[PDB]
Amino acid sequence: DSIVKASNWRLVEVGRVVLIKKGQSAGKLAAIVEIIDQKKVLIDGPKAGVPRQAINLGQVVLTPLTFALPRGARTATVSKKWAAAAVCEKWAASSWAKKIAQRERRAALTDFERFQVMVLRKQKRYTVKKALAK
């Protein structure tokens, strides 16, 4: 009987899908191909659209999702492995991508849509309050 708790870290490695935080391809997924050094990692996001390049780890944030990928894979092989792993489907199901989509939708809302949202929220609150205390 042994216990080792709270040791889950998102290791950076080959095949580690990542999300770009800053740069031209900000907000676009990328996959780490080969690690250059402690501060430089090669990434490829052909499915997303970002061209293959060496990016600084400070400009990108890792993600929990992972998939197998041969070291130093080319663009074609990286895209093939990305399609096979279907990491996109897992990404959407995660609450992180859902939060991103919700934020984008809220930023894309209109004044009339905002009024409709307000009315629907009022109705939902009335229904919830009626349900409560019963």
Binding site: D1, S2, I3, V4, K5, A6, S7, Q38
Partner: protein, 174 residues
């Protein structure tokens, strides 16, 4: 700079190790020992339920020192829990007999009226020799050191005068 350096600790079938945030706990036949390592900044893993790894990432020699000493401390704790540690000291006197009563009090040391007392932090048992045993190595060792360091022969020749109590033997209780 080292990308990742790890050290291994064995887990005998007779003990169980429960690891959370750096605080470390050990359980075994002789009892349970716990220690705090929140200031050491190391990580632990459960590789196969029988071996415990301590690793440091992007740590230099300064951090590697703590990385390695973590293994030594854990091994010492495991050995103490499984078997324990024993310490002994010898009574030597030329003219004035030394009487010791258990807190441990030393009387009639070099004809000194004052009674030197060393608090007990570890057990006392018995030739003219004391036996100290305890699960924690640090506690028993510090008690022995304090016992040896209270008998200071101030303003006297070190070589000529040998009266006092000194550590003689070390080993496991088993």
């Amino acid at each position: 700079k080292y990308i990742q350096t790890e050290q291994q600790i064995e887990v005998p079938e007779g003990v169980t190790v429960s690891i959370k945030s750096r605080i470390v706990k050990v359980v075994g036949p002789r009892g349970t020992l716990t220690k705090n390592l929140k200031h050491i900044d190391v990580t632990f893993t459960k590789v196969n339920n029988q071996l415990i790894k301590v690793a440091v990432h992007n740590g230099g020699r300064k951090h590697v020192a703590a990385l390695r000493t973590v293994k030594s401390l854990v091994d010492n704790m495991i050995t103490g829990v499984t078997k324990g540690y024993k310490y002994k000291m010898r009574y030597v006197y030329a003219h004035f007999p030394i009487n010791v009563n258990i807190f441990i009090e030393v009387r009639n040391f070099l004809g000194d009226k004052k009674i030197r007392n060393v608090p007990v932090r570890v057990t006392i048992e018995f030739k003219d020799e004391i036996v100290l045993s305890g699960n924690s190595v640090e506690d028993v060792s510090q008690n022995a050191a304090d016992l040896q360091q209270i008998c200071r022969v101030r303003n006297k020749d070190i070589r000529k005068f040998l009266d006092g109590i000194y550590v003689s033997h070390k080993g496991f209780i088993t």
